[PDB]
Design a protein around this ligand. Structure first.
Ligand SMILES: Cc1ccc(CCNc2ccccc2)cn1
Ligand SMILES: [Zn+2]
Ligand SMILES: [Zn+2]
Length: 582
């Protein structure tokens, strides 16, 4: 308690000595509440006019138009301490899983240099504005780094002063850039050296890319076993127990020297104890603390979520195989048997899973997994939208399984080669491309974001008739040489000015390890669509009057956006399609 957080609290109290007050009508039950002080401030989603003017039929689809308008009663919940049998299962599995991840990897500190290059090329590192303006500025000023140095030597002492969370089914805890550096210094290796790559972790898909996920699920399908299970957790970050935070910290057991102590301090002082500032309109700033739940860099969050999810799903698999009888208490011979299962089949059981943070797909040995619920519920990883003790509904077809907001189609090219393509409801795809985050967008920057979406659609969603046409129209309407941009940057092969047919050939043919014949595709017309009926099932407007008029008159929409942008160099991409090829 206050021995570890007091200093951080004491320091904030002093910066607001003219305001401090222990409010008696504080809404916190599960969060500890320490006091309040005076503030006054708020970021809404804006429409991209380039994308909207080239997708007119969707102006009347409420699923699209509603996305652009606009649970903190889940963060103030509490999760029970697992039973002893659960606690033992988790420690043994965690110990074994860190060893496995570490067999071909070396933990190591990430560098000021590495950190600097990151900020000088926009990765969403969730920092805050206030002594400097942008993050780009603070990284060049050597004053900053003295602040970093001060805190860093404080962490080696086992104390913390400036590492304080700022809270904003989503909640994003920004820290000041310096606190983000110290987190990145200690744990960045997990992301930077790909600890959750499929090759290294067997279950993971870090760095895989949307054009690989389908092929990965198809490979899991090829295993002998039961249904494929894809249970989402209800508010995963709110269900991370102090016992989970402690099993995560065991990665420090693989470290040394300074690194080991820096990592230990990040775990002890920012993860297993937290200080947070929250806005309350009643607008003051509440300073509250707690020990448990997830609150870290969104990137260290991803990796530790993958880790703990891998762990939970191996244990749920153990329960289905009757490796242990009861979560109440493991016997001495039950521990040997758990350890022995891990040594004997653990790697095989990891390969039976695709895990992306809180998202999983499991193909267990058989369907006993479906009703193996005691460990999963006792770890606090309670399934969304099913009664606590109701058996999981499995999927019988890998092409129906949900994963990372997608499903996957098998699509046979006119030459017999097999593409596995990602897909989702086209209303979702169009509604997201029509949205921009932030203010101060020039027409030119708005147009280059539109173009990033168009090139993504050409690479990932080429098989959707409406998105290949809209993508061709956007790339026709935006100057040929203007570079695609994004403000909150998987593998993003569409972020390039290279020819999209050439990138398609690289991604789907040349670099695709599931394609034996490497014959390049010579034109876009060799590249197939879904069946007409499947395209409509997944949200196509093909067959509507509105869509027929849009398609037929597309050159008039393209010309409207060209006229707005002005007299620039443009390419006509519409003759890459058969119907416009005269
Ligand atoms: C470029 C293009 C493609 C298809 C169509 C017609 C789709 N009609 C249909 C009927 C019943 C089930 C599914 C589709 C029009 N334009
Ligand atoms: Zn600190
Ligand atoms: Zn689909």
């Amino acid at each position: 308690n206050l021995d570890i957080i007091g200093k951080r609290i004491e320091k904030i109290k002093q910066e607001h000595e003219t305001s401090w007050h222990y409010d008696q009508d504080h809404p916190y039950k599960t969060w500890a509440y320490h006091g309040s002080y005076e503030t006054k401030q708020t970021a809404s989603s804006m429409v991209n006019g380039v994308v909207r003017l080239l997708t007119k039929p969707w102006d009347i689809i409420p699923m699209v138009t509603q996305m652009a308008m606009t649970f903190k009663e889940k963060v103030d919940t509490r999760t029970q301490e697992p039973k002893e049998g659960t606690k033992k299962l988790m420690k043994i599995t965690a110990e074994w899983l860190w060893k496995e991840l570490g067999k071909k990897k070396t933990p190591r500190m990430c560098t000021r240099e590495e950190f600097t290059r990151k900020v000088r090329s926009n990765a969403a590192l969730g920092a805050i504005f206030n002594k400097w303006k942008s993050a780009r500025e603070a990284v060049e000023d050597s004053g900053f780094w003295e602040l970093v140095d001060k805190e860093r030597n404080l962490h080696l002492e086992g104390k913390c002063e400036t590492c304080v969370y700022n809270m904003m089914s989503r909640a994003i805890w920004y820290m000041w850039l310096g606190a983000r550096f110290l987190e990145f210094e200690a744990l960045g290796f997990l992301n930077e050296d790909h600890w959750f790559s499929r090759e290294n972790s067997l279950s993971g898909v870090e760095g895989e890319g949307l054009h690989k996920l389908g092929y990965i699920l198809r490979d899991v399908s090829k295993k002998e076993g039961g249904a494929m299970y894809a249970d989402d957790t209800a508010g995963w970050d709110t269900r991370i127990t102090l016992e989970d935070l402690k099993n995560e910290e065991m990665v420090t057991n693989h470290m040394e020297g300074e690194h080991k102590k820096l990592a230990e301090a990040i775990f002890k002082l920012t993860y297993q104890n937290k200080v947070v500032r929250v806005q309350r309109p009643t607008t003051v700033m509440d300073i509250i603390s707690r020990r448990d739940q997830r609150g870290s860099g969104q990137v260290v969050t991803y990796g530790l979520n993958t880790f703990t999810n891998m762990e939970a799903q191996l244990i749920r698999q153990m329960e289905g195989e009757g490796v242990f009888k009861s979560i109440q208490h493991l016997t001495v011979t039950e521990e040997i048997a758990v350890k022995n299962w891990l040594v004997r089949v653990g790697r095989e059981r990891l390969s039976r899973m695709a895990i992306s943070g809180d998202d999983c797909v499991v193909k267990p040995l058989d369907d006993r997994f479906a009703s193996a619920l005691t460990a999963l519920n006792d770890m606090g990883k309670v399934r969304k939208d099913i009664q606590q003790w109701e058996p999981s509904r499995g999927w019988n077809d890998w092409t129906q399984v949900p994963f990372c907001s997608h499903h996957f189609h098998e699509l046979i090219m006119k030459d017999g080669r097999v593409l596995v393509v990602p897909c989702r409801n086209q209303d979702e795809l169009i509604g997201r491309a029509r949205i921009s985050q932030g203010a101060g967008w020039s027409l030119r920057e708005t147009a280059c974001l539109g173009k990033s979406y168009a090139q993504m659609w050409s690479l990932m969603y080429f098989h959707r008739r409406d998105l290949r046409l809209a993508a061709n129209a956007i790339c026709s309407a935006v100057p040929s040489h203007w570079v695609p941009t994004s403000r909150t940057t998987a593998t993003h092969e569409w972020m390039t000015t290279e020819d999209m047919l050439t990138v398609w050939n690289r991604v789907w043919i040349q670099e695709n390890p599931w394609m034996e014949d490497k014959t390049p595709v010579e034109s876009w017309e060799e590249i197939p669509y879904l069946g007409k009926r499947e395209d409509q099932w997944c949200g196509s407007l093909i067959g509507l009057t509105s869509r027929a008029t849009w398609a037929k008159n597309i050159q008039t929409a393209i010309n409207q956006v060209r006229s707005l942008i002005g007299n620039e160099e443009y390419t006509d991409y519409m003759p890459s399609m058969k119907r416009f090829r005269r």
